[PDB]
Amino acid sequence: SPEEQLLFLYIIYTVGYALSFSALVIASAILLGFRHLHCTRNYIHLNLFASFILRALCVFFKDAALKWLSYQDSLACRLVFLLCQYCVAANYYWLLVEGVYLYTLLAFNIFEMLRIDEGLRLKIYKDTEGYYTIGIGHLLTKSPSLNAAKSELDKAIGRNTNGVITKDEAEKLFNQDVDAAVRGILRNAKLKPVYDSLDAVRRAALINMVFQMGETGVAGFTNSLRMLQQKRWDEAAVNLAKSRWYNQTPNRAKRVITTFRTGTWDAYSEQWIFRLYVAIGWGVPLLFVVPWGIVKYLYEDEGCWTRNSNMNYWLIIRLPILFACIVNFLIFVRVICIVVSKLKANLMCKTDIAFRLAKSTLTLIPLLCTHEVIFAFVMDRFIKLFTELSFTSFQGLMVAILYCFVNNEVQLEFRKSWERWRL
Numbered sequence: 001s002p003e004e005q006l007l008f009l010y011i012i013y014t015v016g017y018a019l020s021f022s023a024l025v026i027a028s029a030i031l032l033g034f035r036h037l038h039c040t041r042n043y044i045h046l047n048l049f050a051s052f053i054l055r056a057l058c059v060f061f062k063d064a065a066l067k068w069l070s071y072q073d074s075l076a077c078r079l080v081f082l083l084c085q086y087c088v089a090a091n092y093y094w095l096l097v098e099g100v101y102l103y104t105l106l107a108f109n110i111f112e113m114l115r116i117d118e119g120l121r122l123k124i125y126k127d128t129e130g131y132y133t134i135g136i137g138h139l140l141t142k143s144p145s146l147n148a149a150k151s152e153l154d155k156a157i158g159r160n161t162n163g164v165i166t167k168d169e170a171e172k173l174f175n176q177d178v179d180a181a182v183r184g185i186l187r188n189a190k191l192k193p194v195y196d197s198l199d200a201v202r203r204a205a206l207i208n209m210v211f212q213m214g215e216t217g218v219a220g221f222t223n224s225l226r227m228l229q230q231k232r233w234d235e236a237a238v239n240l241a242k243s244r245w246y247n248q249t250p251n252r253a254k255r256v257i258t259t260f261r262t263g264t265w266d267a268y269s270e271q272w273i274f275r276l277y278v279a280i281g282w283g284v285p286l287l288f289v290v291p292w293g294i295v296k297y298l299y300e301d302e303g304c305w306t307r308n309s310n311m312n313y314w315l316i317i318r319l320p321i322l323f324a325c326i327v328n329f330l331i332f333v334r335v336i337c338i339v340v341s342k343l344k345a346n347l348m349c350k351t352d353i354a355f356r357l358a359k360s361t362l363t364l365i366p367l368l369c370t371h372e373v374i375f376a377f378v379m380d381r382f383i384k385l386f387t388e389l390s391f392t393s394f395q396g397l398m399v400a401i402l403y404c405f406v407n408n409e410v411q412l413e414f415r416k417s418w419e420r421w422r423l
């Protein structure tokens with residue numbers, strides 16, 4: 001039947017946005033509700049949920065306006081449609097920062113963590129403790145003799161030093177020290193069981209302490225090491241502050257303790273980077289949605305601008321979303337090259353945040369951007385194509401599932417809260 005087909009597609013579309021709206025409001029309430037879920041990764045998700053929540057609000061407002069000059073001729077409809085088109089562009093640009101974040105998350109490691117904390121030295125320097133240092137935190141000997149320190153470094157580099165050591169030689173010696181740090185942990189009875197239980201992010205935090213202090217030095221933190229192995233991060237965070245290490249070097253310790261408490265790299269992230277993501281997700285859509293809205297009002301104003309078939313005014317809202325999808329597929333392909341490399345080299349386990357986040361992001365990129373790339377320059381079997389209405393309505397539900405309800409961290413918070421109710 002023709003009327004029955006048009007009515008049935010309306011139901012799966014409206015229940016699609018009803019299930020997506022409720023799931024995204026519940027999902028966003030979970031990420032805001034639990035304090036341990038307050039990290040840059042989940043804040044990026046909250047802006048992405050907000051763009052799908054406002055899109056749903058436009059769909060429910062358009063439908064509510066059907067009940068009582070027709071609505072197609074009104075100015076209110078054109079605004080609801082302009083706001084809807086702003087939400088669609090935000091969905092794809094918050095999906096771009098979602099990919100851009102993931103890619104930088106795969107790029108940050110212990111070597112980049114220590115290069116920030118230890119810094120770089122070109123020439124030999126006698127530090128406050130009496131130890132001669134050079135490169136990226138490479139301590140030589142406490143022996144007060146620059147002549148013998150240069151000779152001690154000469155055997156540890158290959159050729160004659162003179163004093164100045166190049167950027168490549170320092171990185172060569174840096175890989176040695178980081179390899180010497182991990183061999184020490186695994187060669188220690190009190191550090192191997194806690195390191196093997198820690199995730200890749202909290203492992204780098206343990207290596208960082210060993211790099212500065214030493215294998216036998218950090219092994220003394222018997223009180224902190226046990227509550228780390230027992231996954232009690234918040235209890236270990238306040239206990240590590242009550243240390244000699246925290247009062248000696250406080251700016252470095254606060255960063256390492258945050259990485260143990262959260263299991264993220266946020267204490268090494270710059271505050272302007274997140275301000276650049278909000279400028280992409282909510283800023284860039286405004287730069288092409290409002291010129292589209294102005295040209296449609298002045299040169300193609302006919303039935304809430306639904307008659308979008310006359311000039312280049314279609315391309316100004318379809319070329320920027322194609323650009324966000326082409327770059328999202330370039331990230332998609334490159335992220336897969338990095339993830340399969342880190343898994344094969346045993347640099348990553350599938351239980352780590354970078355893999356599980358990749359497992360959801362790499363799903364949503366071809367889920368939202370494949371249609372846009374395939375039918376890239378098509379302006380305008382009718383029942384079979386009307387199945388696009390089912391996926392654009394349930395989009396929000398899928399985002400809420402893959403970035404919240406199947407997330408392992410949120411499931412920890414529900415069980416941790418339920419256990420506190422009993423105890």
Ligand SMILES: CC1(C)CC([C@@H](Nc2ccc(-n3cnc(C(F)(F)F)c3)nc2)c2ccc(C(=O)NCCC(=O)O)cc2)C1
Pocket residue numbers: 335336339340343353356357358359360362363402403404406407408
């Ligand atoms: C809609 C579906 C049927 C498809 C979805 C499914 N997609 C998926 C599954 C696996 C790989 N994959 C494996 N290896 C590689 C490689 F090659 F190494 F990159 C990629 N890629 C894509 C999925 C399943 C599980 C999760 C998941 O638990 N999320 C929670 C993690 C989090 O948010 O913190 C997410 C997505 C489910």
Ligand SMILES: CCCCCCCC/C=C\CCCCCCCC(=O)OC[C@H](O)CO
Pocket residue numbers: 025026028029032033043046047050053
């Ligand atoms: C308990 C809450 C239940 C109510 C249901 C929620 C309704 C959904 C709408 C908006 C919230 C999502 C948008 C706000 C989150 C983004 C915050 C932000 O802009 O920046 C990140 C952070 O604040 C910098 O550190």
Ligand SMILES: CCCCCCCC/C=C/CCCCCCCC(=O)O
Pocket residue numbers: 032
């Ligand atoms: C319209 C529904 C209301 C939704 C809230 C508005 C969104 C602004 C974000 C803040 C949510 C308020 C909950 C507090 C969590 C923030 C944590 C904090 O920094 O204190």
